Symmetry: C3
Subunit: 215 residues, 3 copies
């Protein structure tokens, strides 16, 4: 059960169990902003997972208090989880800001942390959310909360979202990863081909509609 | 006028329903002034957010008793005028600050706002079926769209009355506040929206509601078809007479 | 008040306009035997022939709602969906596999805090379940329920945020009756016209994707 980093060493791959792989985002310099290094290393991580079809669950996470921070001051990640053939769990133990929040919403299962901040903050900068965001937030959070989240671009603690009602488990940051592993262990009780077929079914419409409805 | 138009800061326009006489039911005046208020806002590219609200303990009460009788008689339809879509057609975000009771068509009108805020103490109901006729005003579309299909079946089939607090216990995605705070909250949200450029607000709303603007006419048509089957019976006239405001 | 042919479903008239359909195959704990299937089909055909009824309350007995597909090898689920009037699934007992899914085909779904619910189908839930679960529970929560095929107490679902009334088992049937009385105050025509409108797409889409 190995542990390696990717080419620029800002993602670490950690085999938790024979059929569970954890993708750990750890660009400490950029607090996991979408730098070119995090971008390349994440693609590599999911390319590695595609190349080794023994896994039954992916757990995507960040480090300390940062899940992902979205596009940098200078500056396709979203579809990585959606196109991965097996269930991906976004364990958002840390802040999820902008495209970093949205990216988590494309995983099959999403876990929030109570103390962390989440924001689709695009509009705070004057611009509209990617078309990827505008498509996925309503689908994962419902239409009405998506309106509010996208139009106003405000900042939400995990606890406030929890209070407003979201379908995601919301937990103390210190528990998010443990819960994600337990959940990955339960997923791994299934044959890998049943998980893939079922995922194929559940996300067909997204994979079919996302491509076009992207321009 | 029974509708008052208040600017807040530079770019917020408050639309206050205040037909005290009919408790903000759809009197002919309220209807006309609402259409006109929204026409005037659409013509003003200063505005970036609308706050739709009522007065005192009332947000909006839906059809007047005379109103519903005239329809029941075959004289008029809910599609005459077209209130249901005011907030959906408005290019800028609309906040329904439901500081008071939302009843029947008045509740449904408000649900077409991009952001809906309820009062904990007030009552909300899609009470169309209490009178024995089927939901109008886009209720069969916007209620499942905002509150989810499951909860909407219960709301629409049974026509029950819920306090804001009940809806908050069932898990609705709207912010629920004591009544005294609903309008303050709407204002801060509106200022926060007004910080964005207008073109971005309009463009993002266009993208979020295209599918609603596309689909809503076909649902209005289905609903008119259900009205033709259910409105024009004697037991419906008895219900509008005996159960109104009950 | 009388039983169906195999005796494993009791029809109980609560009032003139409210009919209770009680599944009570005690031997199989409301598993999907031939007898339960035939008796439920019989129950819903009786209801169709007796349009004084304006609401149906579908129920199990004791701590069981229904336990799903028979040790043996469906068309069942469309029973509540194709019923002209509103059906309330008062799931006062466990809902396992198909027994959870059948309840989700009712117009109103009431869970019991203390009861266990799962869509637990080496088999993919197929159906059916992958059809109706996201539509009733919402997409995101469905992904979890389906991918993991986990078991949940009613109280767990209530904390995670379902649109269903979730009650102590002891109050479930009482709440169902109160709601059924409120539904029965509407004219029948109104109820059936609205239901036809609300569940038309489901009636449409189910047959196609019951070959797939």
């Amino acid at each position: 059960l190995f542990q390696g980093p990717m080419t620029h060493s800002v993602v670490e791959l950690i085999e938790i169990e024979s059929a569970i792989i954890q993708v750990k985002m750890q660009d400490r310099t950029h607090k996991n902003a979408f730098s070119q290094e995090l971008t390349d290393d994440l693609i590599q991580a999911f390319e590695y997972i595609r190349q080794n079809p023994k896994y039954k669950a992916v757990i995507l996470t960040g480090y300390d208090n940062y899940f992902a921070s979205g596009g940098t001051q200078e500056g396709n990640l979203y579809s990585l989880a959606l196109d991965c053939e097996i269930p991906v769990i976004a364990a958002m133990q840390g802040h999820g800001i902008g495209g970093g929040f949205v990216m988590g919403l494309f995983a099959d299962i999403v876990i929030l942390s109570r103390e962390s901040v989440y924001t689709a903050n695009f509009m705070k900068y004057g611009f509209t959310p990617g078309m990827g965001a505008t498509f996925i937030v309503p689908k994962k959070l419902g239409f009405s909360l998506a309106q509010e989240i996208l139009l106003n671009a405000g900042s939400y603690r995990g606890a406030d979202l929890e209070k407003r009602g979201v379908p995601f488990k919301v937990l103390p940051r210190a528990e998010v990863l443990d819960y994600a592993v337990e959940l990955a262990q339960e997923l791994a009780e299934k044959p890998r081909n049943s998980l893939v077929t079922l995922k194929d079914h559940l996300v067909a419409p997204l994979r079919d509609q996302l491509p076009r409805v992207i321009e």
